[PDB]
Amino acid sequence: SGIIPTLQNVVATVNLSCKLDLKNIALRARNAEYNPKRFAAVIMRIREPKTTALIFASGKMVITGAKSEKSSRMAAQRYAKIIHKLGFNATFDDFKIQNIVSSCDIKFSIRLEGLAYAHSNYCSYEPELFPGLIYRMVKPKIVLLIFVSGKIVLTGAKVRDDIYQAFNNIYPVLIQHRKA
Amino acid sequence: SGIIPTLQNVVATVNLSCKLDLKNIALRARNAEYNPKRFAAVIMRIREPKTTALIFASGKMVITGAKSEKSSRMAAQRYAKIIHKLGFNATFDDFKIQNIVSSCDIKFSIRLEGLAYAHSNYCSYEPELFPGLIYRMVKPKIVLLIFVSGKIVLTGAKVRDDIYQAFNNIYPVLIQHRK
């Protein structure tokens, strides 16, 4: 856990050109399952690197678990190829990153009460209801979760640059609220 | 905990017209303390209803703990009156609600994974990092925290109406992911 945000998860979507028989994908695929009472999609997993694909009846596919935009796109391509080798007429259309989650560690403790009451129109802190402080940044559009320990989670990014920009914005605020 | 959002906390600010001696407020006030190494403001509390005021050297005051907009304003007025009775020349200027937090309970469990992967551009779910699902609503501007238990917390509202509208918006999504 470094000071510069490390990507923890990238979620992407792609549209397959055709409707897929989910039960049959689960039957033929070596590492895919379909239990519609547990989850309304085929769950298919690749081991290296570790990702998961959620394959919906509509032909939409969600790819999750990747640690970068590049790794997300490569994973999506691999799942498409797996589905094509199973005999379905899918195409790879409209790949799009939907969310990027990241974290960092400033290595000092934060007095969350001080931060919350100094910036009450941008954040919420209610430890009875949730742990840590929720900061809604507007420029860029990022939601930060700020913890007493100095761990920071940044959510909602669509491109990496917004993650870094958001952290550059918040850092001088965090330093103002350091505690022992 | 009802289905309609109940306000849990209202945070407001007001500007006092004058700089205040924080040590002296803490000395003279029956229920106020000042420990600058612990918190950089006077902390003053009134018992009924329970609220807390944070009084800053700049003359800015934050009022917290109120359960409605009306109770927030009445509390702010009471703190101002307390400060005025202590001998400071403060005025009550620019009262403003900054945040309203609320909660409700839909009384069924939610498959958070289903909601997250159906709406991944609006929400984040990473239980290794945080509990429950964080949903950033745009219209109105509200952040919702959605828990497996069916408890919902709505944050970031400036007026009550936005809380209700945000919950009206999310409810049909939650019902789609019941477990």
| Inter-chain CB proximity A113 and B145 less than 8 Å | no
Domain that holds residue B172: 1-11+98-179
B74, amino acid identity: M
Same domain, B108 and B176: yes
Structure tokens at B84: 């005025």
Task: Answer yes or no: do A41 and A6 share one domain.
Answer: no
B103 vs A contacts (CB less than 8 Å): 129
The Cα of B52 is separated from the nearest Cα of chain A by a number of Å equal to 11
B70 and B118 share a domain?
A: no
- Domain stops at, among A62, A97, A132: A97
Residue with tokens 């100095």: A150
Residue of B155, B162, B177 to mutate for A, most A C-beta atoms under 10 A: B155
Task: Show which of B65, B97, B129 is a domain's final residue.
Answer: B97
Mutate to test the interface with A, among B109, B117, B149 (most CBs of A within 10 A): B117
Quick one: A7 and A41 in the same domain?
A: no
Question: Same domain, yes or no, for A165 and A108?
Answer: yes
Question: How many C-alpha atoms does A1 have within 13 Å on its Cβ side?
Answer: 13
In terms of Cα–Cα distance, which of B27, B82, B24, B88 is closest to B52? B82
Write phi, then psi, for A8 (nearest 5 degrees): -105, -30
Whether A122 and A178 map to the same domain: the answer is: yes
What are the structure tokens assigned to A102, written together? Answer: 């990241």
Beta-carbon count within 10 A of A29 CB:
18
Technique used by the depositors: X-ray
B27–chain A nearest CA distance, Å: 22
Burial of B88 (0-12, 13-18, 19+ CB in 10 A): buried
Domain final residue pick, A97, A130, A158:
A97
A157 with A144, same domain? yes
Same domain, B115 and B39: no
Other beta carbons within 10 Å of A153: 21
Contacts (Cβ under 8 Å, ≥6 apart) of A98:
A11, A12, A13, A62, A158, B120, B121
List of chain A residues whose C-beta atoms are within 8 Å of the C-beta of residue B152: none
- Cα–Cα distance, B87 to B18 (Å, whole number): 12
Tell if the CB–CB gap between B117 and A41 is shorter than 8 Å: yes
Q: Which residues of B fall within a CB distance of 8 Å from A156?
A: 124, 136
CATH number of the domain that A34 lies in? Answer: 3.30.310.10
B153, B159 Cβ separation under 8 angstroms: no
**Exposed e or buried b for every residue in A42-78, given b needs 16+ CB within 10 A?**
bbbebeeeebbbbbbeebbbbbbbbbebebbbbbbee
Do A4 and A26 reside in the same domain of the chain?
no
- CB nearest to B99's CB, from A9, A103, A121: A121
Q: Where are the alpha helices (DSSP H) in A22-130?
A: 22-28, 69-85, 112-118
A128 alpha-carbon distance from chain centroid: 26
Contacts of A98 in chain B (CB under 8 A): 120-121
Question: Quick check: A41 contacting B, CB < 8 Å?
Answer: yes
Co-location of B36 and B89 in the same domain: yes
Only one residue has tokens 């309609």, namely B4
| B172 shares a domain with B114 | yes
Q: State whether A68 and A137 are in the same domain.
A: no
List the resolution, Å: 1.9
Domain count, chain B: 2
